[PDB]
Amino acid sequence: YVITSFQVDRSSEAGSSINVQVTLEEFRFKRTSDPKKAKNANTGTKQTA
Amino acid sequence: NQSKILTLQAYDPAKVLVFIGGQRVSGFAADTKIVITRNNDNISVHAGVDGEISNALSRDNTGVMTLSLQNTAKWNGYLAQWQRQANVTGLIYLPVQVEGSQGLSLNTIGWIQKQPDLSYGTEVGQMDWEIGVLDAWLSPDQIQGIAAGITGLLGL
Amino acid sequence: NQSKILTLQAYDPAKVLVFIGGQRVSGFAADTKIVITRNNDNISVHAGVDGEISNALSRDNTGVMTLSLQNTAKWNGYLAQWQRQANVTGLIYLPVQVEGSQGLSLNTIGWIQKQPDLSYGTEVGQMDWEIGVLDAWLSPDQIQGIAAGITGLLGL
Amino acid sequence: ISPAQQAQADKRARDAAAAKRKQDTEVSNAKSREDIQYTMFVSGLRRGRL
Numbered sequence: 001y002v003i004t005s006f007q008v009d010r011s012s013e014a015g016s017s018i019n020v021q022v023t024l025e026e027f028r029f030k031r032t033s034d035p036k037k038a039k040n041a042n043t044g045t046k047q048t049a
Numbered sequence: 050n051q052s053k054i055l056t057l058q059a060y061d062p063a064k065v066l067v068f069i070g071g072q073r074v075s076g077f078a079a080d081t082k083i084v085i086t087r088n089n090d091n092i093s094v095h096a097g098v099d100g101e102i103s104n105a106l107s108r109d110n111t112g113v114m115t116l117s118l119q120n121t122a123k124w125n126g127y128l129a130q131w132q133r134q135a136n137v138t139g140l141i142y143l144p145v146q147v148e149g150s151q152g153l154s155l156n157t158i159g160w161i162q163k164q165p166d167l168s169y170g171t172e173v174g175q176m177d178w179e180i181g182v183l184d185a186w187l188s189p190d191q192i193q194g195i196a197a198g199i200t201g202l203l204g205l
Numbered sequence: 206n207q208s209k210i211l212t213l214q215a216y217d218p219a220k221v222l223v224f225i226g227g228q229r230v231s232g233f234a235a236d237t238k239i240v241i242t243r244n245n246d247n248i249s250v251h252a253g254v255d256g257e258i259s260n261a262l263s264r265d266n267t268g269v270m271t272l273s274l275q276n277t278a279k280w281n282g283y284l285a286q287w288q289r290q291a292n293v294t295g296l297i298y299l300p301v302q303v304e305g306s307q308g309l310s311l312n313t314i315g316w317i318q319k320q321p322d323l324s325y326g327t328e329v330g331q332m333d334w335e336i337g338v339l340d341a342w343l344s345p346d347q348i349q350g351i352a353a354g355i356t357g358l359l360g361l
Numbered sequence: 362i363s364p365a366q367q368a369q370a371d372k373r374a375r376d377a378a379a380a381k382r383k384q385d386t387e388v389s390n391a392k393s394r395e396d397i398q399y400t401m402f403v404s405g406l407r408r409g410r411l
Contacts, residue, residue, distance in 0.1 A: 092317070
């Protein structure tokens with residue numbers, strides 16, 4: 001879950017404290033690696049590095 | 050300290066003079082002649098977010114004046130006729146003055162706010178007229194030794 | 206245990222001194238001289254969703270002080286003149302001090318909040334001035350043996 | 362209209378135009394001074410931020 005927005009305020013009431021609101025949403029997420037797990041990859045055309 | 054008499058002469062209810070339009074008013078009833086009150090406070094306070102206090106003076110000074118009369122007084126008819134005339138033409142503003150005895154006084158311009166309610170019963174009833182006044186700041190006037198006292202107060 | 210006298214000398218209403226601007230005030234009435242009160246509580250509590258309690262200290266400390274006087278006292282005129290002057294110019298803040306007897310005391314800066322209402326009746330009336338004060342924390346001051354007692358309280 | 366009314370018309374153009382010059386020049390003075398910084402103390406003045 002990633003944070004998309006939050007709010008902070010210090011109203012006259014409840015002094016010496018802060019009210020906090022947060023919002024989160026799901027994330028449908030889908031090198032040094034073992035050669036046995038490696039898969040053929042690509043990097044496109046490349047120029048002088 | 051010991052006891053002390055606040056004044057020299059006693060407060061006398063008949064010494065309080067009420068003038069509306071330019072004529073003294075007679076016919077008061079019960080145990081309360083007039084009541085003068087304001088509509089809003091003089092200063093409103095607001096809290097801050099870090100302890101500061103901000104004060105704001107009020108710029109409205111209207112008030113109310115309740116006049117208690119018997120329902121056998123001619124001033125009831127006077128006020129009723131004035132109300133009808135004001136409704137017909139438009140002139141509603143007349144001077145109002147109250148000269149208190151050993152107390153604060155008033156001098157401003159007033160108007161008739163709300164007509165009281167009659168109640169015919171076994172005894173003699175009471176009618177209370179609400180008279181609204183433009184300025185409701187009470188004036189020391191007769192009380193002496195006020196100018197010197199005012200300059201005595203310190204403050205910063 | 207048996208009975209016990211709380212103090213050694215009796216509480217005396219005349220021993221309570223009230224100072225406004227730098228002058229003692231005389232002319233109190235009825236059976237209540239002054240009343241000191243706050244406007245908000247010291248701490249506000251909030252419930253949680255799983256039993257936790259969160260407390261928040263308040264940062265506003267203004268209060269009110271009701272002064273009861275007869276309508277035959279010159280301090281009425283003093284206050285009225287001060288109110289008019291403050292309205293005209295802008296200076297409204299003056300010092301206020303109350304020295305209690307066998308009780309808590311006060312020392313802060315105050316102002317005039319609301320003008321009372323006159324009432325001319327058969328008897329002598331009463332006017333109640335609301336004086337607002339910046340800080341309304343009462344101080345033990347005269348009471349002795351407080352510094353030692355404060356360090357005695359345990360807590361965690 | 363009248364010749365006298367021409368003077369009244371001229372006053373409108375001058376006073377109205379002069380008003381914007383005072384506002385416009387003052388704004389032009391800003392955005393020219395780079396050695397000036399503005400800070401607002403919303404809170405905290407009496408706690409640490411002094």
